[PDB]
Amino acid sequence: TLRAAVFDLDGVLALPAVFGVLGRTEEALALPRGLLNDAFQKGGPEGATTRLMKGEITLSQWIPLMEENCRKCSETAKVCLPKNFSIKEIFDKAISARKINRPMLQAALMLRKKGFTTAILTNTWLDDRAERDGLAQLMCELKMHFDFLIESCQVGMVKPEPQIYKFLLDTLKASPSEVVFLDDIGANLKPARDLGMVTILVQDTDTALKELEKVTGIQLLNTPAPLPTSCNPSDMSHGYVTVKPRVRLHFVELGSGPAVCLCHGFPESWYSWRYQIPALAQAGYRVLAMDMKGYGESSAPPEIEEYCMEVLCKEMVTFLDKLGLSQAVFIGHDWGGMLVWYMALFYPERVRAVASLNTPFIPANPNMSPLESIKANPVFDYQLYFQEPGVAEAELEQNLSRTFKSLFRASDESVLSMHKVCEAGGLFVNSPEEPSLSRMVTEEEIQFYVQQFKKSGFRGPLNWYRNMERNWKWACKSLGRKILIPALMVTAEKDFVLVPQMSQHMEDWIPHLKRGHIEDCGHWTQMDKPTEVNQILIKWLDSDAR
Amino acid sequence: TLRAAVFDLDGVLALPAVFGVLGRTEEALALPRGLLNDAFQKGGPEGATTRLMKGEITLSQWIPLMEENCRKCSETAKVCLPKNFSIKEIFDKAISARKINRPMLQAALMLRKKGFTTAILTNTWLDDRAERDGLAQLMCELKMHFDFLIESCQVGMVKPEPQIYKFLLDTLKASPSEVVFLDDIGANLKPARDLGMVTILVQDTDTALKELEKVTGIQLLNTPAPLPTSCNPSDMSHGYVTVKPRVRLHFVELGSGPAVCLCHGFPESWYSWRYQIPALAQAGYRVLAMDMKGYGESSAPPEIEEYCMEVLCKEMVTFLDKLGLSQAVFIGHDWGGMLVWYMALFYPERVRAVASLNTPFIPANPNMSPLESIKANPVFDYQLYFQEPGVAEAELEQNLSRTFKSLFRASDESVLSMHKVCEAGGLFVNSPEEPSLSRMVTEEEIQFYVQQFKKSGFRGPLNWYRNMERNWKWACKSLGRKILIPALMVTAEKDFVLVPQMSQHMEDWIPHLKRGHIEDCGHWTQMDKPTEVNQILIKWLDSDAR
């Protein structure tokens, strides 16, 4: 019958607890046992600490009142505090040391996923120290995972006053027997028990999680590692920039710090980076995930030459100019990866660092048209099928649900004949009309892509393939150059089109190239192996793009 | 008959020139005269430097070819280069030293304002050095002021080849006798002269500006300092965030670096910060200029309680959460300034620094309702007029052009009876039906505000005045606190409503408060004295908010 779980911050969701530092400070300074804890609670409901927790005063106003409390306590104990005693120094180190208790947060996320309402109820203060940003960052990371955050200093009440428990129940819209309450301080559990709530005293994490498992009937300990956190489209900041008359680019933006621009492939969306966007922002970066030209909310003009590399790269430079960005890190996948190599070759001043997932850097052959290279290979027969305007559009737009369900599949779930596409007369000729759902995607995720492609269709996206000769002529101007800015190439073991061996001569052009490799990964890298992608990108950004 | 002016970058728009460093390096190192200049030009059209300027190779590829050229030149001169000789060190220092030639840029801006087409035509390279950002920033600042930027390394041609001059004329759509060409290198003028263009050899800035004045008939030297650069609404990045169902906030965004949030007053728009937005972004900040709730493209719900301070401050915190910002600097004016003091009092962790233009911090009096304080003063009689829903709306919405033309005026151009507004029966009862245009604003600027207020009217904006009792009750909770984060108060000498003497007791609440004062400034601070505002804010941000 439980349907809500309430957690404390200090000592429960974040470790170590502040009170723990008071005891460790006493032992380190050879002070009488409990002395700093007595000064902290000095006065009870009338004391300085209660005024602080109720929001009457700020942390900087409380520090000298706590220092005065430490002297009154030392005088009655007949001891002398060291000459270098500082409450600010002690509290600063305690707050900095506090980190998220990962297994406790994972249990909260699992309960929320199974239908529970989750909340944080904490005794906290108005932090106005010069170092207050460290605390703001902690709260931001936690608050996105809970339904409610109730802070004592904002509501004017504190634990253990019985009215804060009534306020909590009114907010949750639940009766006490439907609520689990976790706290590390016994006195704070007593009022919740008097009301009828299930209480768990937190001394060590594992024992508290075992009690929680037993009482909710859900497995929380020994569970598989969850997928990274993903975006909700309606919670994102949406940005719109006009780069040319009748050409507007849409993007999604999150975080602060060095700008990182994400460039998707075919036939994708900004939504293909849903697992990377929160991870990269949390790592200290300002992420801009684009809808490339021809896709989603970006403009989709019908003319073929609007999609040649020269025009696309120039519009990306105009995008940085209108946003007031002198530089950005460029990360691309598939057609987006092809574009980011050309950005580094033609506009290195604007590119802080360049990374490509799956797409190798392949230099143009001045002795052979790209049409002849494509005809002398059976794996690229689909590129000839994509040439005639109207042909692939009619097949791909006929049933959008079938199109995305057939393309977005893991390497072992393939349902498409990759060869003799032209001979067969289409991409889906030997394919089922109702394909099964892949393990990589949910029905809700597929429907987001369906909704986006209902707006402009496949004309714009397919035109990226209809400029082979124009792109070849433009690329021939860079054959004498080398890429000498920080670069990363990530290969995917099981990509059918972009095999890892197609990247082996890149070191001749990018002599200081860094590499990444993902085993058991197909073409749709970001959604196939999201944890592995995040780890490779974050490590490279922190060392080579900082 | 002149209608286009073309400028070189090196030696003309940016000083000192690169060639100037080669000569100064020779003198400093006691090398033979002209040695480094001979190595630089070694090979002519077939030499390394021409390949660099045409985009065949990058700057890092050219450095060791230039080092080899310096050795071949030294061998034939029978001299030895010092043991610590480095082309990279020499070029790095030269590029860093180069700064915008302010009077040359001012002359370019004046000509553009008088109808001329302006362009930069330069011999430049693909910069891939680790320090390339310094150059990208320089180009970004310059490119926003010119119609065209033609770089040799992007077009594959160089000065003095005659085809680059033909390419320039085709781009400008003009005949040679309609073009003025400025360059510091004589050889680069010769082809432009052969075509019939007016040429100016730049040796010193003043003499070149005198020749330019004489030939265009426009005064360029000894002119009054121009106003700061202003935004074009259609060139801005527009951002939209949903903070609550049916409540979406619109903002304009520019720059990179620490986030700065601008909060306008009544009855204004994000457009009221048009002179501060480019200046703050250029100073190294990421500016977010809001349309506050009830205004422009932000949501404007009709309910009065949607505009009380508690709700407004909470939505501003949700805005930072959805954008992934742990902190922002908050700068407000008028009603926006009132809001930023309450953000610092209730959410100090989220506020890096706080600044208010005109609006002082006035603490609530727990012994008297704000309605009684307003009735015991004749200058605030307009606040009683704004109380009754529908009354001030009908008068202010009747003729939008008259409304904005009557309000947006300098201190000496006032046309409104400020007292006995209720007795008189309105704000505009003794006002002309067609008021003259103020010197602060253009007709085009007034029409932007007219267009914005056509969407939602005055209901939302007026509701900010209809929560006096609710705001008073909420503010009473902070009477024991002090503002101890970095703070700035800016007073305006001639503001009729917010007189500087209303701010005199702020030091009791904000003991380390910094101050600014603007003489001969009325209520509309940002557009009345924009240069003075920019200088006060930039100085304070760089010292107290960095």
Ligand SMILES: O=C(Nc1ccc2c(c1)-c1ccccc1S2(=O)=O)N1CCC(F)(F)CC1
């Ligand atoms: O065509 C691609 N990739 C690519 C992306 C998505 C799909 C295919 C190929 C493909 C091929 C055959 C059948 C179905 C499909 S699919 O619709 O699943 N590229 C060429 C240009 C590049 F090198 F820039 C990057 C890779």
Ligand SMILES: O=C(Nc1ccc2c(c1)-c1ccccc1S2(=O)=O)N1CCC(F)(F)CC1
């Ligand atoms: O009402 C204001 N300012 C303000 C802003 C704009 C105009 C007036 C007052 C006003 C007053 C009388 C006639 C015309 C006009 S007006 O439409 O030109 N404030 C009160 C709350 C505050 F203290 F937060 C900031 C200042």
